[PDB]
Amino acid sequence: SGAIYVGNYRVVNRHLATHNDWANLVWEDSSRDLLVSSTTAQGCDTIARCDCQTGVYYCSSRRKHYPVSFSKPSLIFVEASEYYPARYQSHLMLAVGHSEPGDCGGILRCQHGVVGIVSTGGNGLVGFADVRDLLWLDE
Numbered sequence: 581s582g583a584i585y586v587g588n589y590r591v592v593n594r595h596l597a598t599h600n601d602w603a604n605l606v607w608e609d610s611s612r613d614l615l616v617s618s619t620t621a622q623g624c625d626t627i628a629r630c631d632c633q634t635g636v637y638y639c640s641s642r643r644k645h646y647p648v649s650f651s652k653p654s655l656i657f658v659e660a661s662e663y664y665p666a667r668y669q670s671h672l673m674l675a676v677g678h679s680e681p682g683d684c685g686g687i688l689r690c691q692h693g694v695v696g697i698v699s700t701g702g703n704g705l706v707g708f709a710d711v712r713d714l715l716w717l718d719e
């Protein structure tokens with residue numbers, strides 16, 4: 581679990597969105613596993629606007645942060661789950677690191693701010709849904 585709170589927006593994994601997220605929907609994209617909902621309170625986070633390929637992510641299944649080298653956002657095949665059929669997930673970044681299903685929502689940050697959230701993993705890999713291209717989050 582986990583979310584990004586920036587301005588009057590809450591960014592979560594689309595497959596973990598609540599009834600309240602859907603009732604306050606701003607934008608969602610099944611191909612990216614992302615959903616953004618509106619909030620009444622002002623958020624705590626800053627979004628990175630950069631091309632960093634190194635950062636640190638929070639891994640809830642270890643209660644620890646780990647440093648990672650990650651690939652540029654791209655289209656990657658993701659096997660069928662209870663949430664989605666087998667498909668290509670877009671804007672996805674891979675890195676070597678521990679992750680388990682319940683780790684989705686953990687934040688990946690670089691020195692410039694929030695880069696994205698854990699969305700996939702397995703076999704010593706961790707995949708992150710990028711948010712740096714969503715310029716409208718800052719207005």
Ligand SMILES: NC(=O)[C@H]1CCCN(C(=O)Cc2cccc3c2OCCO3)C1
Nearest residue numbers: 613658661663679680681699700701702
């Ligand atoms: N973006 C998607 O389509 C997700 C939706 C939720 C399920 N899924 C995963 O990859 C879950 C997962 C995360 C992290 C480590 C995992 C793991 O699955 C087992 C092995 O280790 C695909």
Ligand SMILES: [Zn+2]
Nearest residue numbers: 630632690692
């Ligand atoms: Zn950066």
